Design a protein around this ligand. Sequence first.
Ligand SMILES: CO[C@H]1[C@H](O)[C@H](O)[C@H](C)O[C@@H]1[Se]C
Ligand SMILES: CO[C@H]1[C@H](O)[C@H](O)[C@H](C)O[C@@H]1[Se]C
Ligand SMILES: CO[C@H]1[C@H](O)[C@H](O)[C@H](C)O[C@@H]1[Se]C
Ligand SMILES: CO[C@H]1[C@H](O)[C@H](O)[C@H](C)O[C@@H]1[Se]C
Ligand SMILES: CO[C@H]1[C@H](O)[C@H](O)[C@H](C)O[C@@H]1[Se]C
Ligand SMILES: CO[C@H]1[C@H](O)[C@H](O)[C@H](C)O[C@@H]1[Se]C
Ligand SMILES: CO[C@H]1[C@H](O)[C@H](O)[C@H](C)O[C@@H]1[Se]C
Ligand SMILES: CO[C@H]1[C@H](O)[C@H](O)[C@H](C)O[C@@H]1[Se]C
Ligand SMILES: CO[C@H]1[C@H](O)[C@H](O)[C@H](C)O[C@@H]1[Se]C
Ligand SMILES: CO[C@H]1[C@H](O)[C@H](O)[C@H](C)O[C@@H]1[Se]C
Ligand SMILES: CO[C@H]1[C@H](O)[C@H](O)[C@H](C)O[C@@H]1[Se]C
Ligand SMILES: CO[C@H]1[C@H](O)[C@H](O)[C@H](C)O[C@@H]1[Se]C
Ligand SMILES: CO[C@H]1[C@H](O)[C@H](O)[C@H](C)O[C@@H]1[Se]C
Ligand SMILES: CO[C@H]1[C@H](O)[C@H](O)[C@H](C)O[C@@H]1[Se]C
Ligand SMILES: CO[C@H]1[C@H](O)[C@H](O)[C@H](C)O[C@@H]1[Se]C
Ligand SMILES: CO[C@H]1[C@H](O)[C@H](O)[C@H](C)O[C@@H]1[Se]C
Ligand SMILES: CO[C@H]1[C@H](O)[C@H](O)[C@H](C)O[C@@H]1[Se]C
Ligand SMILES: CO[C@H]1[C@H](O)[C@H](O)[C@H](C)O[C@@H]1[Se]C
Ligand SMILES: CO[C@H]1[C@H](O)[C@H](O)[C@H](C)O[C@@H]1[Se]C
Ligand SMILES: CO[C@H]1[C@H](O)[C@H](O)[C@H](C)O[C@@H]1[Se]C
Ligand SMILES: CO[C@H]1[C@H](O)[C@H](O)[C@H](C)O[C@@H]1[Se]C
Ligand SMILES: [Mg+2]
Ligand SMILES: [Mg+2]
Ligand SMILES: [Mg+2]
Ligand SMILES: [Mg+2]
Lengths: 223, 226, 226, 226
Amino acid sequence: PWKGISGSLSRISAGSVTNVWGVNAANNIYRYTGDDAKPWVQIPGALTDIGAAADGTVWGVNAAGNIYRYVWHWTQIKGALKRISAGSRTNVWGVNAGGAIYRYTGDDANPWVQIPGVLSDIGAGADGTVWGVNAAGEIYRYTGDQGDPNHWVKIPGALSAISAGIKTNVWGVNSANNIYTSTGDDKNPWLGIGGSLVDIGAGTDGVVWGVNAGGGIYRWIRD
Amino acid sequence: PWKGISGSLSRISAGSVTNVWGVNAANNIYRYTGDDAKPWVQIPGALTDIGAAADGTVWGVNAAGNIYRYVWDSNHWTQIKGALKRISAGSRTNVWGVNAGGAIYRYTGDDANPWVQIPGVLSDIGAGADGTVWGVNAAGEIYRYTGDQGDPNHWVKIPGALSAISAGIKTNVWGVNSANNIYTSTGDDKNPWLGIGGSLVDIGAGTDGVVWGVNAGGGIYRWIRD
Amino acid sequence: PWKGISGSLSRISAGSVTNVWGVNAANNIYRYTGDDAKPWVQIPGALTDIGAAADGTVWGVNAAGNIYRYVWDSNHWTQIKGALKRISAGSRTNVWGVNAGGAIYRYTGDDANPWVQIPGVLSDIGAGADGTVWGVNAAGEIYRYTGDQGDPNHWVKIPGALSAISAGIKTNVWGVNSANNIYTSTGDDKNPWLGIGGSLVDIGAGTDGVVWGVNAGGGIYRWIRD
Amino acid sequence: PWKGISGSLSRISAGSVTNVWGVNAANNIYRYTGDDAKPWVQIPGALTDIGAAADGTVWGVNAAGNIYRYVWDSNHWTQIKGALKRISAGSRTNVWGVNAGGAIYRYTGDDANPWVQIPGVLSDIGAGADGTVWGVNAAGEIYRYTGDQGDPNHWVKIPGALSAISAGIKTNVWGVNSANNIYTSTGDDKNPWLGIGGSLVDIGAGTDGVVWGVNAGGGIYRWIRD
Ligand SMILES: CO[C@H]1[C@H](O)[C@H](O)[C@H](C)O[C@@H]1[Se]C
Ligand SMILES: CO[C@H]1[C@H](O)[C@H](O)[C@H](C)O[C@@H]1[Se]C
Ligand SMILES: CO[C@H]1[C@H](O)[C@H](O)[C@H](C)O[C@@H]1[Se]C
Ligand SMILES: CO[C@H]1[C@H](O)[C@H](O)[C@H](C)O[C@@H]1[Se]C
Ligand SMILES: CO[C@H]1[C@H](O)[C@H](O)[C@H](C)O[C@@H]1[Se]C
Ligand SMILES: CO[C@H]1[C@H](O)[C@H](O)[C@H](C)O[C@@H]1[Se]C
Ligand SMILES: CO[C@H]1[C@H](O)[C@H](O)[C@H](C)O[C@@H]1[Se]C
Ligand SMILES: CO[C@H]1[C@H](O)[C@H](O)[C@H](C)O[C@@H]1[Se]C
Ligand SMILES: CO[C@H]1[C@H](O)[C@H](O)[C@H](C)O[C@@H]1[Se]C
Ligand SMILES: CO[C@H]1[C@H](O)[C@H](O)[C@H](C)O[C@@H]1[Se]C
Ligand SMILES: CO[C@H]1[C@H](O)[C@H](O)[C@H](C)O[C@@H]1[Se]C
Ligand SMILES: CO[C@H]1[C@H](O)[C@H](O)[C@H](C)O[C@@H]1[Se]C
Ligand SMILES: CO[C@H]1[C@H](O)[C@H](O)[C@H](C)O[C@@H]1[Se]C
Ligand SMILES: CO[C@H]1[C@H](O)[C@H](O)[C@H](C)O[C@@H]1[Se]C
Ligand SMILES: CO[C@H]1[C@H](O)[C@H](O)[C@H](C)O[C@@H]1[Se]C
Ligand SMILES: CO[C@H]1[C@H](O)[C@H](O)[C@H](C)O[C@@H]1[Se]C
Ligand SMILES: CO[C@H]1[C@H](O)[C@H](O)[C@H](C)O[C@@H]1[Se]C
Ligand SMILES: CO[C@H]1[C@H](O)[C@H](O)[C@H](C)O[C@@H]1[Se]C
Ligand SMILES: CO[C@H]1[C@H](O)[C@H](O)[C@H](C)O[C@@H]1[Se]C
Ligand SMILES: CO[C@H]1[C@H](O)[C@H](O)[C@H](C)O[C@@H]1[Se]C
Ligand SMILES: CO[C@H]1[C@H](O)[C@H](O)[C@H](C)O[C@@H]1[Se]C
Ligand SMILES: [Mg+2]
Ligand SMILES: [Mg+2]
Ligand SMILES: [Mg+2]
Ligand SMILES: [Mg+2]
């Protein structure tokens, strides 16, 4: 099931059990302390989406679309994005307000390359896994680095938010707030997990965190 | 070549050099200690197959078909609903099994609804930390999973014949045939197996390259490269 | 058994076979080179404890209690505000320490506000790449962190007595007691430790299975399995 | 020291102990089997440089400059548009090359638009699983990539001279100079290299610490620590 963790967040990302970040409705930024009794520290800045990777990589975008990378507070990286996901230093993707899709090049002076397609959310994993959903709710998995010249393969179902920590840990929520996890069977690809969430973050190590419409925060209790 | 390790085991699984478990003919459970002078510690419980992952995840099944996950606390094991005969854990997120009728199952991550059936028929399976999955059927035919890579037939047949298989990562795949001959994957599907000297009935191939096996008389071996 | 490695060190930390660091009695800092013929290179600075992670992260504290993180450039170290006496780095995201009054701290990832106090009292701590954390208190009592797993008491006591502890991953946990006796975790909380021949005063257990130690006379050892 | 391994190779790359590939003077391709008694299996195709990652990713270039990625199925290789002379694969997401005019390229993850030029001029490059990238230029000057860390000049020069370099992770960086002398990085940019006994013309340094090399007469060696 799910365990409630005190606090309020509107978007959340989990790269690993030790790297979990979110933003609240007001755009305040928080990182998970590892202490469930005192679970958040506020990190200076303002963001509306955030992507936290297994290796400690953290990227975010603000309401205007400005893009930032955490420097271990924030360095702006040129461009404009509306949603962002970071699975690792080398696998960072986002989408802009118009739905265009970009992947980070690793060159801060020329930081994005556009990837053909249209998406409204995206999840990028440490292992290179990339999944997305479009405005209508259609679901895609990236194949453009695997020889597919149409880049994306549609996977049945409908989701509004998605997160991929690894090939084997992919979760999303539909517009109704129903929660799904990928089965690993493209012909029968989702299994419903009880609960209601509006955003979700799935880590490479299996950790899964989510927030519901009211801002309540949950960690999946797999044991 | 192989280094002989003291003790007696019937099935074995290796996820990493620090997470290697086995079961003996009496169904006792043992974990490798890291010291070849005192290699095994008995973990309470009874199992007939076991899967141990690099991330620490350990799953097992017993003679009745009951399914267990190790909980790393003083309760030791939790029973997960269902019935399985063989099991393999590549990681927390990549756990597969085969039931007594040869049906194939993948763990869903929901203990309340824990398995989805994956099409096919197998007799042994090996799952890895990177999502890699290989299986063998009762006639010895060998398959690698493709159902998460857009293949509507779920599995691709790889030439050869094996009776047990293990695949802790895409790059470390090993099996044995019914005659106890040992093979490792070349990574070339058109020339897929290299014979390795020795004799084993079960094998465990870790994500980190460790390889452990057991032979028909209970003898235990670890692979030595240097 | 242990292989003796030349040189002299007082404390040691191993994150992986390629990231092993120590300090000597003079507070000089050394990094393992990967060649047992010329095993140490002195890194400029002065420290009394050090934590080295598999991901390359290295943290240290000096005799004054000052806290440093290695920056992997010609500046070498950056001072992080606060005071600590012992430190362990499992990864960039999992760094813990204990101060001179036994209070426990976890790194927040914000150098401007770097520590949160975790309830408890300890004298040594070992943090891993998977989030695993073990500690010991001054009476030798042993604890494993549970405060990120819903436990309002933050730690579970594990039977036994140790004075130094290291835990680079859930599956590779080692310690020494005040008499210099060496123990490794069995993974069974009801039968938790296996004695290992040898004698050490500090130990470092890597994510990849590497294990290094130092003895009371400064002697340095690496664990050999094969 | 080095262990000699049978066979003959001209260039080599090691991503992990289980993913090591090379090419010989005839441009034949070989993969390491894991058994030093029968160490190589020829993989069909022709290449002049190769990069093999810990995650299984393998890229290569041929004498014409054509670029290939291994597809782990019976087709073996897929050609990727462009021309390169040297290549290194740290992981699926971190692949770099140098073309015959010394221009530097990073893989974009889009086979239809596969390369972005990174400013600079190099003659060899080594990329790691953690994003680490090192290069050398034709005069032997050594650089480490900083262009993803806010540096508008993209590279920092590290003292010394090398002709081939490999960097499977931040903590395992090795090279050779034009005189075939072997060096490993100390992690101290002000005292950056340790000389290692032996003689090699190419080297591959894995994410897991494995190190392989080849010498001018085709001789193949693996580094042994214990
Ligand atoms: C993460 O939850 C936040 C919440 O969003 C509020 O900002 C509140 C004032 O602070 C809590 Se953290 C105690
Ligand atoms: C990440 O937070 C940003 C914020 O969104 C504003 O752009 C502000 C002007 O700069 C801060 Se960076 C401290
Ligand atoms: C990622 O930022 C994008 C931005 O969203 C615009 O599409 C702009 C036309 O292109 C930049 Se990338 C130069
Ligand atoms: C991922 O982008 C999708 C897009 O959202 C549309 O569904 C379009 C019809 O197909 C593309 Se896939 C090139
Ligand atoms: C993930 O897609 C879901 C979809 O959102 C609907 O809830 C539908 C009723 O079930 C599908 Se899963 C067959
Ligand atoms: C994660 O789903 C939550 C849901 O959002 C509601 O808060 C409900 C009251 O509790 C469930 Se937890 C089964
Ligand atoms: C692992 O080998 C075991 C063996 O299976 C027997 O249980 C025997 C009683 O003890 C040996 Se060593 C623990
Ligand atoms: C793993 O061992 C199992 C055992 O096989 C029995 O099913 C017993 C009922 O439960 C133990 Se675990 C309490
Ligand atoms: C994995 O367990 C299977 C079991 O073997 C049976 O096929 C049963 C009909 O379905 C269950 Se799925 C809980
Ligand atoms: C893996 O399952 C195999 C099965 O063993 C049979 O060979 C059957 C003819 O093919 C299925 Se693949 C759908
Ligand atoms: C792995 O398959 C083996 C098979 O089991 C037989 O030993 C056969 C003689 O050789 C094949 Se490898 C061509
Ligand atoms: C690591 O051992 C050191 C030792 O601590 C002394 O600094 C000595 C001067 O040199 C030996 Se070897 C570098
Ligand atoms: C790690 O070494 C430290 C040292 O202990 C001193 O505190 C000195 C003030 O700073 C050096 Se790093 C400049
Ligand atoms: C980690 O440093 C601690 C320090 O030891 C003191 O307890 C001080 C009162 O609080 C600081 Se937290 C910056
Ligand atoms: C880890 O801290 C321990 C402490 O050392 C004491 O044993 C105390 C009685 O228990 C606390 Se656990 C809240
Ligand atoms: C790790 O704990 C040790 C302890 O330090 C003593 O050596 C005691 C005699 O044995 C216990 Se292990 C039962
Ligand atoms: C890897 O070494 C090879 C060598 O390059 C030659 O192709 C030779 C014909 O066979 C040796 Se061993 C496969
Ligand atoms: C990797 O080998 C290549 C080879 O070099 C040739 O370019 C040929 C045209 O293609 C083979 Se792969 C079909
Ligand atoms: C990597 O290939 C390069 C190539 O070497 C040339 O510089 C060409 C002008 O640009 C291509 Se980028 C497809
Ligand atoms: C890596 O490229 C180097 C290049 O080799 C030259 O040394 C040039 C003077 O500096 C560039 Se760094 C912009
Ligand atoms: C790696 O750089 C080497 C260089 O190649 C020369 O061997 C020189 C004599 O020594 C430097 Se290391 C100071
Ligand atoms: Mg997201
Ligand atoms: Mg098995
Ligand atoms: Mg320590
Ligand atoms: Mg190379």
